[PDB]
Design an enzyme around this catalytic site. Structure first.
Site, PDB file in Angstrom:
ATOM      1  N   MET A 163      27.986  35.067  41.023  1.00  0.00           N
ATOM      2  CA  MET A 163      28.514  33.721  40.869  1.00  0.00           C
ATOM      3  C   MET A 163      29.507  33.386  41.975  1.00  0.00           C
ATOM      4  SD  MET A 163      28.837  33.940  36.763  1.00  0.00           S
ATOM      5  CE  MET A 163      28.972  35.745  36.593  1.00  0.00           C
ATOM      6  N   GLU A 203      31.851  31.108  31.544  1.00  0.00           N
ATOM      7  CA  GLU A 203      30.514  31.432  31.998  1.00  0.00           C
ATOM      8  C   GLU A 203      29.641  31.665  30.761  1.00  0.00           C
ATOM      9  OE1 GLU A 203      30.384  35.378  33.686  1.00  0.00           O
ATOM     10  OE2 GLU A 203      28.440  35.527  32.681  1.00  0.00           O
ATOM     11  N   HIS A 247      37.586  40.741  36.870  1.00  0.00           N
ATOM     12  CA  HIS A 247      38.245  40.071  37.998  1.00  0.00           C
ATOM     13  C   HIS A 247      39.713  40.477  38.197  1.00  0.00           C
ATOM     14  CE1 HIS A 247      35.459  36.571  36.500  1.00  0.00           C
ATOM     15  NE2 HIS A 247      34.749  37.556  37.025  1.00  0.00           N
ATOM     16  N   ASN A 271      35.289  32.362  39.058  1.00  0.00           N
ATOM     17  CA  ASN A 271      34.864  33.691  39.519  1.00  0.00           C
ATOM     18  C   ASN A 271      35.497  33.903  40.924  1.00  0.00           C
ATOM     19  OD1 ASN A 271      32.477  34.881  37.632  1.00  0.00           O
ATOM     20  ND2 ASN A 271      32.411  32.674  37.564  1.00  0.00           N
TER      21      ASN A 271
HETATM   22  C1  LIG Z   1      30.552  43.377  36.103  1.00  0.00           C
HETATM   23  C2  LIG Z   1      31.267  42.445  37.052  1.00  0.00           C
HETATM   24  C3  LIG Z   1      30.845  41.147  37.193  1.00  0.00           C
HETATM   25  C4  LIG Z   1      31.484  40.264  38.096  1.00  0.00           C
HETATM   26  N1  LIG Z   1      30.882  39.055  38.319  1.00  0.00           N
HETATM   27  C5  LIG Z   1      31.431  38.256  39.265  1.00  0.00           C
HETATM   28  C6  LIG Z   1      30.713  37.071  39.712  1.00  0.00           C
HETATM   29  O1  LIG Z   1      29.614  36.756  39.307  1.00  0.00           O
HETATM   30  N2  LIG Z   1      31.339  36.289  40.657  1.00  0.00           N
HETATM   31  C7  LIG Z   1      32.630  36.627  41.145  1.00  0.00           C
HETATM   32  O2  LIG Z   1      33.149  35.815  41.865  1.00  0.00           O
HETATM   33  N3  LIG Z   1      33.171  37.816  40.923  1.00  0.00           N
HETATM   34  C8  LIG Z   1      32.624  38.648  40.008  1.00  0.00           C
HETATM   35  N4  LIG Z   1      33.165  39.844  39.790  1.00  0.00           N
HETATM   36  C9  LIG Z   1      34.403  40.255  40.481  1.00  0.00           C
HETATM   37  C10 LIG Z   1      34.159  40.518  41.989  1.00  0.00           C
HETATM   38  O3  LIG Z   1      33.099  41.463  42.109  1.00  0.00           O
HETATM   39  C11 LIG Z   1      35.444  41.120  42.537  1.00  0.00           C
HETATM   40  O4  LIG Z   1      36.476  40.140  42.404  1.00  0.00           O
HETATM   41  C12 LIG Z   1      35.275  41.440  44.029  1.00  0.00           C
HETATM   42  O5  LIG Z   1      34.237  42.399  44.237  1.00  0.00           O
HETATM   43  C13 LIG Z   1      36.610  41.938  44.529  1.00  0.00           C
HETATM   44  O6  LIG Z   1      36.536  42.207  46.069  1.00  0.00           O
HETATM   45  P1  LIG Z   1      37.541  43.129  46.740  1.00  0.00           P
HETATM   46  O7  LIG Z   1      37.217  43.033  48.236  1.00  0.00           O
HETATM   47  O8  LIG Z   1      38.852  42.890  46.353  1.00  0.00           O
HETATM   48  O9  LIG Z   1      37.282  44.503  46.328  1.00  0.00           O
HETATM   49  P2  LIG Z   1      36.011  45.348  45.723  1.00  0.00           P
HETATM   50  O10 LIG Z   1      34.726  44.604  45.907  1.00  0.00           O
HETATM   51  O11 LIG Z   1      36.287  45.907  44.526  1.00  0.00           O
HETATM   52  O12 LIG Z   1      35.741  46.491  46.676  1.00  0.00           O
HETATM   53  C14 LIG Z   1      36.691  47.548  47.037  1.00  0.00           C
HETATM   54  C15 LIG Z   1      35.850  48.718  47.685  1.00  0.00           C
HETATM   55  O13 LIG Z   1      36.823  49.748  48.168  1.00  0.00           O
HETATM   56  C16 LIG Z   1      36.316  51.059  47.774  1.00  0.00           C
HETATM   57  N5  LIG Z   1      37.542  51.849  47.718  1.00  0.00           N
HETATM   58  C17 LIG Z   1      38.525  51.765  46.762  1.00  0.00           C
HETATM   59  N6  LIG Z   1      39.558  52.565  47.015  1.00  0.00           N
HETATM   60  C18 LIG Z   1      39.188  53.263  48.140  1.00  0.00           C
HETATM   61  C19 LIG Z   1      39.876  54.308  48.899  1.00  0.00           C
HETATM   62  N7  LIG Z   1      41.005  54.852  48.523  1.00  0.00           N
HETATM   63  N8  LIG Z   1      39.141  54.831  49.925  1.00  0.00           N
HETATM   64  C20 LIG Z   1      37.907  54.357  50.258  1.00  0.00           C
HETATM   65  N9  LIG Z   1      37.248  53.336  49.687  1.00  0.00           N
HETATM   66  C21 LIG Z   1      37.956  52.783  48.660  1.00  0.00           C
HETATM   67  C22 LIG Z   1      35.662  50.816  46.443  1.00  0.00           C
HETATM   68  O14 LIG Z   1      34.800  51.887  46.147  1.00  0.00           O
HETATM   69  C23 LIG Z   1      34.875  49.499  46.733  1.00  0.00           C
HETATM   70  O15 LIG Z   1      33.613  49.686  47.297  1.00  0.00           O
HETATM   71  C24 LIG Z   1      32.564  40.762  38.875  1.00  0.00           C
HETATM   72  C25 LIG Z   1      32.931  42.108  38.818  1.00  0.00           C
HETATM   73  C26 LIG Z   1      32.334  42.951  37.875  1.00  0.00           C
HETATM   74  C27 LIG Z   1      32.880  44.342  37.692  1.00  0.00           C
END
Ligand SMILES: Cc1cc2nc3c(=O)[nH]c(=O)nc-3n(C[C@H](O)[C@H](O)[C@H](O)COP(=O)(O)OP(=O)(O)OC[C@H]3O[C@@H](n4cnc5c(N)ncnc54)[C@H](O)[C@@H]3O)c2cc1C
Length: 498
Positions: free
Chosen positions: A114, A353, A439, A477
């Protein structure tokens, strides 16, 4: 072991940063603790579906778990498993369970796809120090394009059995004077149409999403990361987790990185130094790294704001029991396409949602993931004894979120003469799941723990790029906001610092 720029993690913030760095000619190394999801498993597919979960579904757990809201129907398929470097990680804190993706692409691998822009008036409220004009005129459109956001065909949506669950809730909400809105997505809707016609391998229509999609979903490895690798200046090392961060005696940064196999066995621990350090380990990961660095003395100049301001984006899950004449369908697309918009920025605001259910048989249940406006915030405190950041968040802190979600759905129940389900989340008769989070937002808040572009306070060439920057709430989202903000931040950083 020196690389000009190092990006920790491969989620949204990290992917945007690595791409732009590579395009600017900066040799960049991305360190991801999870796997590169490209190897066919025992069933010939990369990811396991929701009806056939195995070790690939979980990050080091000894038993599979049913997707929240479907325990009554999916517990039957649960099985004991070997702790493995699976794709979905349920991080259990004292009174909150945060779900996050683990692998190249981070949460983009397990999310519902989303792609939604926050209400401008709300964005201006939560981030008053940011120029909203630049965000809406330049960065949001840029994120939309790169993410490959697309829109569902209304005629197909209206006629397909795969979205009957969505139409039923729309009709029910309409009786309470509430309207619905189509939700853009990174899952190819054209491909989804072909799935229903039996023309291409099913994914969204084969009960797949939370443990990854074997087709259709344009996760980051296919969009930003693919482009980053295409620059010829970006490399990605998997199963590499950064444990500590310190400032070298000359201003750069050194990291202790552990390399493990898919069974979690430690293969080696190496030292990686760099000039520019970007944290994209997520709200949980980036915050933990910084609170650890501060408290163990490796980054003593970090401020007191590091670890504060965390919020679950007002996440609350609830369900309504439909009348017998309003079946939601046995066939429900795993990708949501409709939502109830009752968000006006006030305390009663709710953006919900309309969530599909994977049961595969008629249950008459309408599931919803509500996003509310709750001022309560938690704090990540470092525990030196276990070397873990602990989230100080109590269940009662979600009371305002539950209250707002309940007030909205009570209106729908009243207009339709229906009642809530009280048995979907456990044996405590709870109609509202208030201790989970998909989230996570906050921990290294923009303007508090960092400057207005994510530059960590107290240090030079040290940046945070992810969900930890968001002040606990966006009203929709979160990944489009995280992506757009990352585009804004890295462009400025490259111009002024690099
Ligand atoms: C089931 C579910 C459904 C969701 N649905 C939606 C949706 O439809 N739309 C929406 O907008 N959002 C959705 N979200 C939320 C969205 O996925 C997150 O907000 C987004 O992925 C966050 O991005 P980010 O870059 O902060 O970190 P993340 O995508 O979480 O990524 C961080 C990455 O860093 C890696 N990592 C962590 N610590 C370390 C370390 N010490 N060393 C090396 N690597 C590291 C992790 O393994 C990961 O791959 C959903 C999440 C989930 C769990």
């Amino acid at each position: 072991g020196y690389v000009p720029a190092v990006v920790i993690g491969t989620g949204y913030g990290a992917a945007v940063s690595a791409l732009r760095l590579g395009e600017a000619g900066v040799q960049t190394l991305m360190l991801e603790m999870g796997q590169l999801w490209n190897q066919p498993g025992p069933d010939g597919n990369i990811f396991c579906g929701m009806l056939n979960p195995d070790k690939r579904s979980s990050w080091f757990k000894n038993r599979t778990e049913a997707p929240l809201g479907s325990f009554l129907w999916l517990d039957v398929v649960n099985r004991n498993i070997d702790p493995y470097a699976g794709v979905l990680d349920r991080v259990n804190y004292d009174q909150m369970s945060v779900y996050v993706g683990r692998g190249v692409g981070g949460g983009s691998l397990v999310n519902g796809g989303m792609a939604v822009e926050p209400k401008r008036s709300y964005f201006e409220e939560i981030l008053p120090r940011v120029d909203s004009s630049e965000m809406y005129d330049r960065y949001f459109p840029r994120a939309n394009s790169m993410l490959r956001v697309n829109h569902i065909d209304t005629k197909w949506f209206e006629d397909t059995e795969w979205y009957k669950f969505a139409r039923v809730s729309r009709e029910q909400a309409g009786k309470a004077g509430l309207g619905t809105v189509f939700v853009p997505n990174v899952y190819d809707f054209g491909y989804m149409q072909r799935e229903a016609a039996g023309e291409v391998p099913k994914s969204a229509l084969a009960t797949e999403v939370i443990y990854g999609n074997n087709h259709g979903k344009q996760s980051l490895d296919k969009t930003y990361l693919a482009a980053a690798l295409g620059t010829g200046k970006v490399t990605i090392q998997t199963l590499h987790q950064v444990k500590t961060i310190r400032q070298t005696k000359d201003g750069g940064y050194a990291l202790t990185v552990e390399q493990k196999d898919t069974d979690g066995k430690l293969l080696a621990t190496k030292e990686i130094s760099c000039r520019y350090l970007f944290l994209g380990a997520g709200s949980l990961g980036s915050t933990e790294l910084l609170v650890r660095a501060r408290d163990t003395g490796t980054l003593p100049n970090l401020n007191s704001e590091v670890g504060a301001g965390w919020g679950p984006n007002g996440n609350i899950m609830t369900a309504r029991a439909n009348h017998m004449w309003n079946p939601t369908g046995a066939h429900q697309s795993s990708i949501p396409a409709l939502g109830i918009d009752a968000w006006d920025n006030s305390d009663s605001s709710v953006f919900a949602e309309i969530a599909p259910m994977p049961a595969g048989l008629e249950t008459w249940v309408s599931l919803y993931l509500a996003i509310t406006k709750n001022p309560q915030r938690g704090t990540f405190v470092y525990d030196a004894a276990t070397d873990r950041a602990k989230l100080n968040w109590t269940r009662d802190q979600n009371a305002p979120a539950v209250n707002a979600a309940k007030a909205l759905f009570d209106r729908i129940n009243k207009a339709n003469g229906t009642i809530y389900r009280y048995d979907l989340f456990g044996t405590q008769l709870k109609a509202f799941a208030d201790d989970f989070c998909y989230h996570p937002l906050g921990g290294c808040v923009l303007g508090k723990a960092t400057d207005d572009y994510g530059r960590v306070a107290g240090y030079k060439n040290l940046y945070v790029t992810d969900g930890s920057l968001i002040p606990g709430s966006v009203g929709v989202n979160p990944f489009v906001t995280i992506t757009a903000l990352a585009e804004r931040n890295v462009e400025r950083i490259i111009k002024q610092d690099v």
